[PDB]
């Protein structure tokens, strides 16, 4: 179960959070990221 720590360190490796618009239409936008929103 050591890999859990490695992946946690990886995700923590990525300061203000910035998301990315992944789709948009009809006045709605979906944004990936922003884990703390």
């Amino acid at each position: 179960a050591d890999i859990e720590g490695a992946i946690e360190d990886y995700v923590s490796s990525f300061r203000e959070e910035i998301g990315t618009v992944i789709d948009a239409g009809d006045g709605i936008a979906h944004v990936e990221g922003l884990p703390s929103v």
């Binding site: 890999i3 490695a6 992946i7 360190d9 990886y10 995700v11 490796s13 990525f14 990936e32």
Partner: protein, 45 residues
């Protein structure tokens, strides 16, 4: 080449076993994660 193929097959079956890593990896730190995970478990190539 044979050793590389065997190692890659083992890696593929492992990745299939745990889909969480693939999910979190599909989206430079990726490499560092790879060495910290299985740097020596697989050959240099």
């Amino acid at each position: 080449l044979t050793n590389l193929a065997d190692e890659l097959a083992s890696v593929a079956k492992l990745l299939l076993s745990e889909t969480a890593l693939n999910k979190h990896l599909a989206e430079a730190p990726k490499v560092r994660l790879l060495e910290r995970l299985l740097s020596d478990k697989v050959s240099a190539t």
